[PDB]
Design a protein around this ligand. Structure first.
Ligand SMILES: *[C@@H]1O[C@H](CO)[C@@H](O[C@@H]2O[C@H](CO)[C@@H](O)[C@H](O)[C@H]2NC(C)=O)[C@H](O)[C@H]1NC(C)=O
Ligand SMILES: *[C@@H]1O[C@H](CO)[C@@H](O[C@@H]2O[C@H](CO)[C@@H](O)[C@H](O)[C@H]2NC(C)=O)[C@H](O)[C@H]1NC(C)=O
Ligand SMILES: *[C@@H]1O[C@H](CO)[C@@H](O[C@@H]2O[C@H](CO)[C@@H](O)[C@H](O)[C@H]2NC(C)=O)[C@H](O)[C@H]1NC(C)=O
Ligand SMILES: *[C@@H]1O[C@H](CO)[C@@H](O[C@@H]2O[C@H](CO)[C@@H](O)[C@H](O)[C@H]2NC(C)=O)[C@H](O)[C@H]1NC(C)=O
Ligand SMILES: *[C@@H]1O[C@H](CO)[C@@H](O)[C@H](O)[C@H]1NC(C)=O
Ligand SMILES: *[C@@H]1O[C@H](CO)[C@@H](O)[C@H](O)[C@H]1NC(C)=O
Ligand SMILES: *[C@@H]1O[C@H](CO)[C@@H](O)[C@H](O)[C@H]1NC(C)=O
Ligand SMILES: *[C@@H]1O[C@H](CO)[C@@H](O)[C@H](O)[C@H]1NC(C)=O
Ligand SMILES: *[C@@H]1O[C@H](CO)[C@@H](O)[C@H](O)[C@H]1NC(C)=O
Ligand SMILES: *[C@@H]1O[C@H](CO)[C@@H](O)[C@H](O)[C@H]1NC(C)=O
Ligand SMILES: *[C@@H]1O[C@H](CO)[C@@H](O)[C@H](O)[C@H]1NC(C)=O
Ligand SMILES: *[C@@H]1O[C@H](CO)[C@@H](O)[C@H](O)[C@H]1NC(C)=O
Ligand SMILES: *[C@@H]1O[C@H](CO)[C@@H](O)[C@H](O)[C@H]1NC(C)=O
Ligand SMILES: *[C@@H]1O[C@H](CO)[C@@H](O)[C@H](O)[C@H]1NC(C)=O
Ligand SMILES: *[C@@H]1O[C@H](CO)[C@@H](O)[C@H](O)[C@H]1NC(C)=O
Ligand SMILES: *[C@@H]1O[C@H](CO)[C@@H](O)[C@H](O)[C@H]1NC(C)=O
Ligand SMILES: *[C@@H]1O[C@H](CO)[C@@H](O)[C@H](O)[C@H]1NC(C)=O
Ligand SMILES: *[C@@H]1O[C@H](CO)[C@@H](O)[C@H](O)[C@H]1NC(C)=O
Lengths: 255, 487, 50, 38, 198, 50
């Protein structure tokens, strides 16, 4: 199942303040109008989902019915739980069960090598990135077919710690893989991000990005080289055959 | 490359690939390359957007069409032997001509730009000799050239003429263009539009003020205007001599071959045309905001270049970091002597590029400003007969108006209209002499024969005073007969 | 983050995670005091041609 | 060539010939007048 | 001081040339601007690096000089075309364009040589010692309106004369310095006289 | 001082008054134009490398 994104999956990229300005960024983002899959928040049969290049996640529900996550390879494994007023973020779920039903527990656990804890009609959204030995948990939420309203995610967490993930399931949740699209971000006078341009969404988006402006006046503009990539790497060498005579000159009976 | 009607008209867009056939990736093929996303359409129009090789693209019933441009309405003017067309009426017209006069007087503290007050970096840069002094000299040169331009254009008038109070200019209504004692500044009503319809924090770089402040350029232009309004050309040649404005206009009509009675017999009508033209010149400027683009472009273009001069300051040039403090803190000084050298040469080269660009633009604006000076010298202080210099018409007069970095001349051109078709003859034969028209041209409708002035149908009986005798009625290629009268 | 300037208290509304801040010229333009988390807004000391 | 290229002129030689034909037909038929008006 | 506009180009060019000389001492971060010295101090594998540094700097300076001389030559050519136009139009002619061949109404011009320039003696007629006269655009007589053929009408307080435009010289109003049209109605400010008839 | 643009004066305009010059002063104005630089040449190799 599918639905398209709109202008969502955008976040403060660099922990550096800017305002009343435009800036060009090359980090991972959710491409505008990428399809996000929709999955059964109820156990009607929830499928368990692949993780690639970082996940945009969103859930639509009152009462926080989506309440946890697990991640890993062949899921040492990241685990997140929000129940009982605590965000528990241990990496301890080394024997996560084959059916991680929320409540009595998702896993068998041991060797909790990192165990950070912090204070944890409505739309909640997240981006999970892994990079450079960090796991970045951007998140934001707003009261309520995702909104066409733009929303810039602030970094809820950025942890100094994957190939697949699963979620601790009336609600629904949406998933979409990021990609390394160049973005131009516009920062308001208050330093919130107010709008963005995907520099690859269409040739007008590319032009907007290349002028560094949202309004493009009527006219004609350069944008790029168009250089065709080579289809193959042919190699031809002079049909030469024997090893060279070096076994003489490094071993002569007298230099 | 992309073509678009621009975001504020529509989100739609089409793309041009400048030298590759469409086989190599709706579609069209042109001498300018492959075009995708525009529908090729079979009639022709003026160019909204140029593509190349006579293909132009535009937004029309909606989609982006591309078309062969049409140069204009092909018409056979009905030339003939024996036939002439004479205008029976006229339409005075006012047109803006807009010229940039100066750019902003940028000045760069070169050592502060390159070295950021590092006592290290400037100790390196000192070993480049004259460069960082020479660039400052060059920018000072163009900066002084900007005041030279603005004085050389506006300061033609030897004195600040003040306009009389009652403004009884024969029914012409200059209150739209003179200063207003409502006094937001010295500015005139049209000037107050121009100062709004175009519009425009640093290290090293600074903007020096112009020598003539805007209220003072407006004061000069109010003086020039009160001159032309009250004294014609005479205030260019000597002291301003008052003359009634209707008589000045009569002289100016007599300057374009229209006999001056053609003014006095029409003055109420003439002034009503002029006032309405001024109203249009206001209303057009109050809405077609792009019309001042000739000025906005230079302001944008300079601001673009200077902005990149700042942006280049952030670039590594291969140095280990783009900030002399952040390298000098971490590197050992013997290696910093290499890294800072990389930064210095990169920044210096970029500054050298900016300064050369500003020299080239300053040379161009100096050419434009001299054209503006000659425009003011001939079209305002005078009545240049130069067949298209002071706008697309016969020139009557022009009025200057100050604009934020330029002049916006209101050229007022007499354009004739409402032609009639007449038969004509080069000469009229009587008593075997040939009579030629002393200043008019002969015309007939066939029933009779008349002389008229050349640019307005006012017929006179042919009367041996308006015509002079010559020849012997046999050498003329196409003479005709009439009973030339004799008072 | 070495430099020079006058440091001023400012209304510059850093979000809680932002730990240094840059201007449209890409120079560092505002920062947070690492001893006290106060927002300090930089501007270079007065200078010009004489 | 590599990198370097020549863009075509906007007004091809046919249209420049067309304009100069128009300027001839103008001057021949009508002298100065077609500069100032019809 | 009058020849300043001409002296400046000699000074600027000399200044640019003079700094082109001074940049030979620049050193550019080589160990000495006198190249024969570094050529004696260092062995070729090093000296080639130092000379590469000097060559780069000297090129940069020379490229600057030649570029500025191109810009300056483009300026002086634009001035030369202006001078050639004034030589054509003001000397070989009497160009009536109001403020080109000097201030005033232009009569004639004489060229003069100057060491890299031209001085024009523009000779111009400037009017002076004006007086105030009442006027009318036209003279009414028999209900016809007589307009002035080439002058204007003026009143000597209480008698009406034609005078040429730019020098007071009265003539009695006649059929021959006037021409007739209209009906003494459409023209405003018309005034009455006995226009004479020879 | 604040610059003066020149001695402000009213043209004695009125709807029926003309001023006509009764006399003249023919006068001579110098105008000065540069028409060449010096013809500099640089032996590029002898400059850079001597
Ligand atoms: C010359 O043209 C003008 C307009 O350019 C004519 O004046 C207009 O005449 C119509 C019809 O009477 C009126 O409705 C308009 O109001 C007039 N214009 C103005 C500005 O008042 C004029 O009639 C023409 N005269 C000749 C002889 O052709
Ligand atoms: C233009 O055409 C009209 C009519 O064809 C001519 O008008 C007549 O002219 C004569 C002589 O001036 C008058 O006596 C008549 O009274 C006019 N007709 C009317 C109805 O009044 C006019 O003369 C022609 N002009 C030319 C130059 O051919
Ligand atoms: C200027 O006006 C004066 C009077 O205001 C004129 O004086 C008389 O002019 C009439 C003819 O217009 C002569 O017949 C008288 O002989 C004049 N009287 C005197 C005392 O001169 C005077 O002529 C006018 N100016 C000129 C140059 O004639
Ligand atoms: C026109 O102007 C000239 C220049 O001033 C006048 O000639 C001068 O007249 C005065 C008075 O006689 C003499 O003192 C000067 O020596 C004269 N100058 C010369 C160069 O001869 C002339 O009189 C004026 N004429 C009129 C009619 O105004
Ligand atoms: C979204 O999914 C549908 C069905 O899988 C597909 O047809 C469509 O192309 C996708 N969206 C985009 C933008 O490709
Ligand atoms: C902790 O890790 C070791 C090594 O992988 C493993 O042998 C052990 O079983 C783990 N702890 C528990 C309680 O299983
Ligand atoms: C910007 O911040 C101020 C201060 O909190 C606030 O009053 C204003 O509404 C904000 N405006 C926007 C557009 O964010
Ligand atoms: C020359 O080329 C062929 C390959 O086409 C190679 O297999 C062969 O051994 C070569 N001939 C000789 C004589 O070595
Ligand atoms: C763009 O359209 C808006 C109205 O939506 C208008 O206010 C603005 O002036 C327009 N700008 C241009 C450049 O057309
Ligand atoms: C490529 O386009 C040009 C345009 O005139 C045409 O002459 C040529 O035949 C085209 N070639 C192919 C292979 O389509
Ligand atoms: C243009 O008109 C011609 C008429 O001969 C027609 O054959 C051609 O198909 C038309 N072109 C297009 C793009 O419709
Ligand atoms: C001139 O035009 C304005 C309107 O722009 C009007 O208010 C004013 O009264 C007019 N003055 C005249 C006709 O003297
Ligand atoms: C003059 O007559 C010709 C022939 O009828 C016609 O084509 C042309 O439009 C006429 N011109 C005017 C101004 O009436
Ligand atoms: C050309 O005009 C002249 C003068 O009316 C006449 O003699 C001659 O016959 C005309 N020729 C033609 C072809 O109209
Ligand atoms: C003019 O009249 C004379 C005599 O009446 C005649 O010989 C001559 O042919 C006439 N003009 C023309 C062009 O026919
Ligand atoms: C004309 O008369 C006025 C007085 O009404 C006077 O102020 C002015 O200076 C006179 N002009 C000349 C040129 O004499
Ligand atoms: C000049 O203005 C006055 C009113 O101040 C008026 O009486 C007179 O008629 C006007 N002049 C003309 C020629 O109408
Ligand atoms: C000229 O004379 C006529 C009749 O004598 C008279 O009606 C008219 O008013 C006079 N002119 C003026 C301007 O008063």
């Amino acid at each position: 199942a599918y639905t398209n994104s709109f202008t969502r999956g955008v976040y403060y990229p660099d922990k550096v303040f800017r305002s009343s300005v435009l800036h060009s960024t090359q980090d991972l983002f959710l491409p505008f109008f990428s399809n996000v899959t929709w999955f059964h928040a109820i156990h009607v049969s929830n499928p368990v989902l692949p993780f690639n290049d970082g996940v945009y996640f969103a859930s639509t529900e009152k009462s926080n019915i989506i309440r946890g996550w697990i991640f890993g390879t062949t899921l040492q494994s990241l685990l997140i739980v929000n129940n009982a007023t605590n965000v528990v973020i241990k990496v301890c779920e080394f024997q996560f069960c084959n059916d991680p039903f929320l409540g009595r527990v998702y896993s068998s656990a041991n060797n909790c090598t990192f165990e950070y804890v912090s204070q944890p009609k409505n739309l909640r959204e997240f981006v999970f990135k892994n990079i450079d030995g960090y796991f970045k948990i951007y998140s934001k939420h707003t009261p309520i077919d995702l909104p066409q309203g733009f929303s810039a995610l602030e970094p809820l967490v950025d942890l100094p710690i994957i190939t697949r993930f699963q979620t601790l399931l009336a609600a629904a949740y949406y998933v979409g893989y990021l990609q390394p699209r160049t973005f131009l971000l516009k920062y308001n006078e208050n330093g919130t991000i107010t709008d963005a341009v995907d520099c690859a969404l269409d040739p007008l988006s590319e032009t907007k990005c290349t002028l560094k402006s949202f309004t493009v006046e009527k006219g004609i503009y350069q944008t790029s080289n168009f250089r065709v990539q080579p289809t193959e790497s042919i190699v031809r060498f002079p049909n030469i055959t024997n090893l060279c005579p070096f076994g003489e000159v490094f071993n002569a009976t007298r230099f | 490359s992309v073509i678009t009607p621009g975001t504020n008209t529509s989100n739609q867009v089409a793309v041009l690939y400048q030298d590759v056939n469409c086989t190599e990736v709706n579609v069209f093929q042109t001498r300018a390359g492959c075009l995708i996303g525009a529908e090729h359409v079979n009639n022709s129009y003026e160019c909204d957007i140029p593509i190349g090789a006579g293909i132009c693209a535009s937004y029309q019933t909606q989609s982006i069409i591309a078309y062969t441009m049409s140069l204009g309405a092909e018409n056979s003017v009905a030339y003939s032997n024996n036939s002439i067309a004479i205008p029976t009426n006229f339409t005075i017209s006012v047109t803006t001509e807009i010229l940039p006069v100066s750019m902003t007087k940028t000045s760069v503290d070169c050592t502060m730009y390159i070295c950021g007050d590092s006592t290290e970096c400037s100790n390196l840069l000192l070993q480049y000799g004259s460069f960082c002094t020479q660039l400052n000299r060059a920018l000072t040169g163009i900066a002084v050239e900007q005041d030279k331009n603005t004085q050389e254009v506006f300061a033609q008038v030897k004195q600040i003429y003040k306009t009389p109070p009652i403004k009884d200019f024969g029914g012409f209504n200059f209150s739209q263009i003179l200063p207003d004692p409502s006094k937001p500044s010295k500015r005139s009503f049209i000037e107050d539009l121009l100062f709004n319809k175009v519009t425009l924090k640093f290290n090293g770089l600074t903007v020096l003020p112009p020598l003539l402040t805007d209220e003072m350029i407006a004061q000069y232009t109010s003086a020039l205007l009160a001159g032309t309004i009250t004294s014609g050309w005479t205030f260019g040649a000597g002291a301003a001599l008052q003359i009634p404005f209707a008589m000045q206009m009569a002289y100016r009509f007599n300057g374009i071959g229209v006999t001056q009675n053609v003014l006095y017999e029409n003055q109420k009508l003439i002034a009503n045309q002029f006032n309405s033209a001024i109203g249009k010149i206001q209303d057009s400027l109050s809405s077609t905001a792009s019309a001042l683009g000739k000025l906005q472009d230079v302001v944008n273009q300079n601001a673009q270049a200077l902005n990149t001069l700042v942006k280049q300051l952030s670039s590594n040039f291969g140095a280990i970091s783009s900030v002399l403090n952040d390298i000098l803190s971490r590197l050992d000084p013997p290696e910093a002597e290499v890294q800072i050298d990389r930064l210095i040469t990169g920044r210096l080269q970029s500054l050298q590029t900016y300064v050369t660009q500003q020299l080239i633009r300053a040379a161009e604006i100096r050419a434009s400003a001299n054209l503006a000076a000659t425009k003011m010298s001939e079209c305002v202080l005078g009545q240049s007969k130069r067949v298209d210099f002071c706008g697309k018409g016969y020139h009557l007069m022009s009025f200057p108006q100050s604009a934020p970095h330029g002049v916006v001349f209101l050229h007022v051109t007499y354009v004739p209209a409402q032609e009639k078709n007449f038969t004509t003859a080069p000469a009229i034969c009587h008593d075997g002499k040939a009579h030629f028209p002393r200043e008019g041209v002969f015309v007939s409708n066939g029933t009779h024969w008349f002389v008229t002035q050349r640019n307005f149908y006012e017929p006179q009986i042919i009367t041996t005073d308006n015509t002079f005798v010559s020849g012997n009625c046999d050498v003329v290629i196409g003479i005709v007969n009439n009973t030339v009268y004799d008072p | 983050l070495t430099g020079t300037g006058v440091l001023t208290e400012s209304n510059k509304k850093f979000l809680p995670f932002q730990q240094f801040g840059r201007d449209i010229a890409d120079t560092t333009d505002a920062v947070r005091d690492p001893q006290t988390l106060e927002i300090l807004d930089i501007t270079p000391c007065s200078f010009g041609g004489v």
